[PDB]
Symmetry: D2
Subunit: 218 residues, 4 copies
């Protein structure tokens, strides 16, 4: 690397609403961007305790920490120091919908993420409002270039208490603030786990491993 | 009427983002709730001039002002003084998506609407970011009861400069803060027009007529 | 009228599959095209008794029989004698999806409709496979012109045994086989009722009233 | 293996419509089911030459030929000799929609696939009707168990002449005709290429490699 150190830290400032319930979150993270290893600690600074499952917010708390092979251009890393933004649509199988926007900037050895989250139509007796989810299954994002933007799609799935899954489709658009070398059709495999939290999830710790790769069968 | 005067006024406090662009709006309205007649004046108090078409925000600026026949229970009017909230999903044909939440309260002769708006994925060269829209075609909302909530669906369409239409599907969920007598399957026809505005739409005036009715052919 | 008599008859030849179950249907209809009045009798000629609700096929069994005011061009009636085709997408709220195609021709005083129906993903314990539906609520199709085609959208709803509704969104594209005068933004209100049928619905009679109109509130 | 030989052959009988255009196809295939290697030759027996891109039909022409590691139960292979069926929804980004149903049976050393294909709303000037597609990008199907069925989702993409991609989302439901041991959350990576064809694609040869695996990052 040259603009992004082998070891970095980052802060998260998130604000939003879920079925009209307002909230604010702040986080402190660290990781090895070139190793795709990452960890972060969140604090519900306002509106807590949250009346909904924390799992819907975990993926909103850091693309620069993705291990990219040398032969696959790293769209996000190249965007700095200028940075980039991302826009996300989350469609859950029971009708709930969330729109999420991020702005990722850099200052020295620290990344700063500002996030706006809007989710609604979560059924009152559903898995989210009843807090019956138990983390996301490891996932694989399909990525490709278009209009100078990187577009990602992921078939997510939340594990349910008592078995089964609660599906959600992800569509994320990454917009670099300056033109960069565009990558080819590829994927990013991820593992995201809550590694610690207090009783009402007003405090949470998350671990994430992200690795880019070319199609397995080609 | 008995809790809602024949002549009312209302204030709008709206905040939100469009493709990451933050903004704030305030409005002063008035109308005859039982006549379904209504008018409001908006001011872009923050983030202006807006880099996107005003038409996407016009429908977010007042259900109590809907003319309901006596034989059709008025879900929204019955909710007061307690009030109600509404959640809306707007799906545009070019992929843009907006989630909108409202809280409607009352104090004396004035209604207060607090609104959060989140819209994204509006193509940079699209009708919204290029401001090529010219108002909404009159519309007709299909409404029915479910789980004590009123659910509405509307096939909206924005007129385009040079002819043609830009489609958007509306889904609005109205949640009364107390149980009320639920209506049967019905519709609400509306006309919404911008009647005045300055050059950069930092100031706008809107007129709306809303009338409920039973199916035309039954 | 001039090419379409005040009193007409028509035949329906429908074939298709539902969750892989093949079937064939034939019908004899009659009505007053300019009065928007219509009736038809269907016979399940193959694959009966059908293991699914008849209601999903009722709307596939006649646009020429729609009452159009003189000041609103009748897209479909103008298409003859050449005729027209229509393509339809039906999205049910529990995930089921149907694609339907029609070809409407004319010979003397009789209309001939050839129909292909493909529906799948109807949950085994759902309202369709369990036959718990009780007819469609009267509906209102939003219609507008684009690319020389007429595009219609309808928020349909099937009544459920024991109360409640089973939602389905309709999108129908009408393609005239020759250019015609295009209508403006309008609606068509309809009432569709099964007026008779035997025990296993291998025989059915349907009545339909269709009337076009301009926006109610304009 | 025990019911499925190390070397198998298969026949394809496909029928369907695209924007109302009827067609029929027959194919002869062969491959090593346990090696996930497969090849097939198709012939447009009726309705040819097809006025649309062949690529939309290539994925409809054989799940038994998927290489499954020993520690991942093979849903499809276990279904035999009874067999299984599959239902598929294809949603293209320009609005086109296809519903596809299959029935897979076995007799000795040969598999027989009966297929019904229904596609419509393909824009006349789009990539499909104008035949501007150049094959599918290698893909990765997300698979999981539910209700005794195997459900798969894939973010497909067709390469376009002159660069760029034409997106399509796949959702396939595999229904075994008898209960079998259900697999865990996994993926199947595939490569599908047209290896030969005549000038108007009335004759086509396809090669496919399919390999199941557990999440890459777990």
């Amino acid at each position: 690397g040259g603009v992004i150190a082998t070891q970095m830290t980052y802060k998260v400032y998130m604000s939003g609403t879920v079925n009209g319930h307002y909230f604010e979150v702040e986080g402190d993270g660290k990781g090895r961007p070139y190793e795709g290893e990452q960890t972060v600690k969140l604090t519900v600074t306002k509106g807590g305790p949250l009346p909904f499952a924390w799992d819907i917010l975990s993926p909103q708390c850091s693309i620069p920490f993705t291990k990219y092979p040398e032969d696959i251009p790293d769209y996000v890393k190249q965007s700095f120091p200028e940075g980039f933004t991302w826009e996300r649509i989350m469609n859950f199988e029971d009708g709930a919908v969330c729109t999420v926007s991020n702005d990722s900037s850099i200052q020295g050895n620290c990344f700063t993420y500002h996030v706006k989250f809007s989710g609604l139509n979560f059924p009152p007796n559903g898995p989210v409002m009843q807090k019956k989810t138990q983390g996301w299954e490891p996932h694989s994002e399909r990525l490709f270039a278009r209009g100078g933007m990187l577009i990602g799609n992921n078939f997510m799935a939340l594990k349910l208490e008592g078995g089964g899954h609660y599906l959600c489709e992800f569509k994320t658009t990454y917009k670099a603030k300056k033109p960069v070398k565009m990558p080819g059709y590829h994927y990013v495999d991820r593992k995201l786990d809550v590694t610690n939290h207090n009783k009402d999830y007003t405090s949470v710790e998350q671990c994430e491993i992200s690795i880019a790769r070319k199609p397995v069968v080609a």
